[model samples]
Target: ETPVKIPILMYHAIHVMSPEETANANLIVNPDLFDQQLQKMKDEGYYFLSPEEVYRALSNNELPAKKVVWLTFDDSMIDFYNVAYPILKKYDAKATNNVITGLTEMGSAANLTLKQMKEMKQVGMSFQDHTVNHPDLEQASPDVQTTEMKDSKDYLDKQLNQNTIAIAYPSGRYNDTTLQIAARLNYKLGVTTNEGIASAANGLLSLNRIRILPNMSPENLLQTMEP
Candidate 1:
């Protein structure tokens, strides 16, 4: 039987934001707080699902554990590697990153470097698609959307040598056309910013995600993850 609930937690930067990140502060969960969050999950016997396990558990209803949580760190920010990686390693927890291929391609220190991603992949970090550029796909033309989605997928595939068939829509925005294109491109899953636990019943391409608010306590987050 399908599990009662699977919480796919959406996260962004893992850092204490300075004045420079006015537009992104809400998304930043300070490093110590992040550590505490994972520690809570570890203490509470939550199983961190791998990318493959997530697909199987959601699509085929194969449960990895009674308490399954999929941690998704979006944007592939440098802080993810700098601050989050060590904590994740300490807990032996696996997480996925939805990367913007354009920034990685640009070789910016603002995001995860190719070397970091490759290293992380060996340690159970799954790199999936965000897009080549972060754009509002709902407002973009079909051609632009196709390029954004396909190219990013292609980049991660060839670079990581894995067939990633999932995406976290930029800004959690999409439309019917987005779903149609995702289907045509063989993206079997897509996540949105919708607040709720995920299950295949929600439609794989329009799966719901629960965001991790800034400074959210470990106990509170654990509460949110519970069925």
Candidate 2:
């Protein structure tokens, strides 16, 4: 039997932008394009798995279906609430967002708000950790790393009442120490910006992801998806 492979699509903003805005564009996908993606995935009979399902799948070394994909959004962008959430709702899909707790605490308008996070959670979206300040965990000391991981995770756990475990390494920046710290903290899956289908061979703490872009068509997605 072929080993189970899960394609975890890494996304960021779901907003419109142009070439002039390209320099500062941080993985921004146009909203219309986003809708097209979910539409196509749905029509193609792709199954979207939640974080808990993913954890179980990876832990048990099995996939839920023949056509499976995991939606993982980084940075808790406000557009996730305004744009992606409704699109996901339209397709009856669920996704997980990695939140930088400090920004929400600072009342940043550009990021997901506490109420919006709860609303999404109520609808089955999960808020995971990206850390407190979105730091480069590779450069941080053990104590500093502890603070970042535990604090962000604790905040999400308490506020969302989610036993937070999944985390996207900020910018795919982390060290060996980062992995150990997270493991000791009980995080099971660590998503990096690195590109590949999710495989147990990659080490559960260093899972790979396929970066989703604005220009990627539904056809491109099917080609890249692990079938």
Candidate 3:
């Protein structure tokens, strides 16, 4: 049977933010806190699901018996490799990293390289598209939106040698046109910045994710995951 709801946790860069990030500390999660979160979930017997598994469960109404959570990291930032990746590996947890393909194309050291992506993929990290430039799709023209989505998917597929079909909107921004274009491009799922537990009732293309903030304790994290 389809589970009633599953918590899909959204994370961005994993790094120690300085005081300058006081206004936006939520965008950067401390590495220690990230590690604690994973250990807490594991100790509590939570199972991690990939983007594809979550979508399939919601679509087909089949989910595992154990409690489940989806760990998704956006921005394809370097800290994900340097910090978050090891912590996840320590707990045997899996996650998805949404990359800005254009950044990788530009050979930016801050973004994940194809080599790093492949190595991480071997260890349970699923990489997906985050558009070519991480633009606000709601504000871009339909043509621009299509190109961004298409190019990103194409790039990830070519580099990673997998069928990339999921997307997390830049800043969780999108419109009806964005949804339409996502479907047209054969994307099976698209996550938004909307805060809530994921359910099949929300539809596949407009899935919601709970934004995980920095300095958030595991107790607080579990509370947020609860209905």
Model 1 lDDT on a 0 to 1 scale: 0.88
Residue 188 error, candidate 2, Å: 1.2
Query: What Cα-based lDDT does every candidate model obtain?
Result: 0.88, 0.88, 0.88
Model 2 lDDT tens row, 138-216: 9999999999999999999998787998988899998899999999999988999889898877888899899997779
* Residues 75-151, model 3: lDDT tens digits: 89899999999999999999999999999889999989889999999998999889999888999999999999999
List residue ranges in candidate 2 displaced over 4 A.
Answer: 18-26
How well does candidate 3 match the true structure in TM-score terms? Answer: 0.94
- Flag clash pairs in model 2: none
Candidate 3 residue pairs in clash (backbone atoms < 3 Å): none
Clashes of each: 0, 0, 0
Q: Determine the backbone clash count of candidate 2.
A: 0
> What alpha-carbon RMSD in Å does predicted model 1 have with respect to the real structure?
1.9
Tens digits of per-residue lDDT, candidate 1, 76-146, equal 89988888888999999999999999999999889998889999988878888899989999999999999
Span of 10 residues, lowest total lDDT, candidate 1: 20-29
lDDT of 2: 0.88
Best-fitting candidate, scored by TM-score: 2
